[PDB]
Amino acid sequence: VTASIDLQSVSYTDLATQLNDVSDFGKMIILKDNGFNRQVHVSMDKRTKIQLDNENVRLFNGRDKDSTSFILGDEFAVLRFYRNGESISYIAYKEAQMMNEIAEFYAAPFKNEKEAFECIYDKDLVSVKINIDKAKKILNLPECDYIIKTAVPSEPKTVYVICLRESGSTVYPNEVSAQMQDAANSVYAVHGLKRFVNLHFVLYTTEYSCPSGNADEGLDGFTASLKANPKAEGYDDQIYFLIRWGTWDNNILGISWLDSYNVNTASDFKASGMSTTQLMYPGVMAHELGHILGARHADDPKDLMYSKYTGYLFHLSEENMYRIAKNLGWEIADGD
Ligand SMILES: [Zn+2]
């Protein structure tokens, strides 16, 4: 029988044993719920590396039509999929205590609610289901937005995306990892860019914190803190994000230096930005990374790079895709 995940009882060990069984050639898995059945073909993401404080996190994806992705670390696992345009995450932490902390963290803003947030049991809490689209309606959270600032190689070039937990912030591994995954997926979906770049995300803590709620001033201080950091000398040519759970003033979800990374000339920590990592705004880091790689605001409301927050995870503008791919060392002759 085809392997299956029962969404009425999915636990960390369910997801871990299914995903640890995914070989280089992929594996069919059926997602099952009441009135719901989706067969997905899962493959390991061999292009993206993630360490969160040296903890290794692996990524998996269904086919494009499957609208399904997974995250797996030693401490947590995520299944996220889209149904009727809504992003549904099943979040499962291995240790009971942390799973309870996570459930209480997600339950707190809500104190039809089960359609937005539900603890999943097998008695014993095994995961939480969050429908962020229903959750934002119930919590009447604002639209939010952005507004930001100014030859196929033999092997893909490794580019580190160094993510720095803002001092005094608390972020959760499932939430940070989801942002990194959508950011990585958003780049690889463009012009076969896996042939050109392999993104390596790391998360550390920084002493820096924004002195105000102004995202512009915060980014100025962040980029300056990188230049003044001895640990970072010699790494001025990588990509940097300051991350927090929350947003900035004026419902600003993130900010970055526009068109500031190019594989030939990257330097001086110019390729820096800031991003929220909270679950209800997927794709913010993807959006800011697109800006860093040269993407500008697109007109299509279904584009990741639309000026307001849309919830879409993929570049649609041919012009942006060109600019991003060019900055990563591709050219039109290379095709897709
Ligand atoms: Zn923007």
Side-chain angles (χ1 to χ4, degrees), residues 60 113 125 163 181 184 190 194 266 274 311:
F60 306 78
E113 142 172 348
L125 173 72
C163 290
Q181 172 170 47
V190 175
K194 81 181 162 201
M274 310 192 301

Side-chain angles (χ1 to χ4, degrees), residues 105-110 113 116-117 130-131 134-136 138-139 280:
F105 170 77
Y106 283 121
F110 302 100
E113 142 172 348
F117 161 77
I130 319 277
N131 183 322
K134 296 184 144 70
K136 278 141 105 182
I138 285 182
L139 302 167
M280 310 256 155

Side-chain angles (χ1 to χ4, degrees), residues 1-4 30:
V1 278
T2 295
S4 72
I30 297 156

Side-chain angles (χ1 to χ4, degrees), residues 40-94:
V40 297
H41 187 69
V42 183
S43 55
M44 231 258 108
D45 180 347
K46 307 162 194 65
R47 326 151 303 188
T48 309
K49 290 148 147 70
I50 294 165
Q51 283 87 49
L52 309 180
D53 317 291
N54 290 322
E55 301 171 334
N56 192 51
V57 177
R58 291 172 286 148
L59 303 185
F60 306 78
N61 294 279
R63 295 158 300 189
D64 282 4
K65 69 193 205 81
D66 292 333
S67 289
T68 295
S69 62
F70 299 83
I71 300 164
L72 178 60
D74 273 19
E75 303 314 319
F76 74 97
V78 180
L79 157 68
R80 184 193 70 191
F81 61 87
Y82 279 74
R83 193 175 190 208
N84 299 118
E86 298 187 324
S87 155
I88 298 145
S89 291
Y90 287 78
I91 297 160
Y93 279 68
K94 183 167 80 155

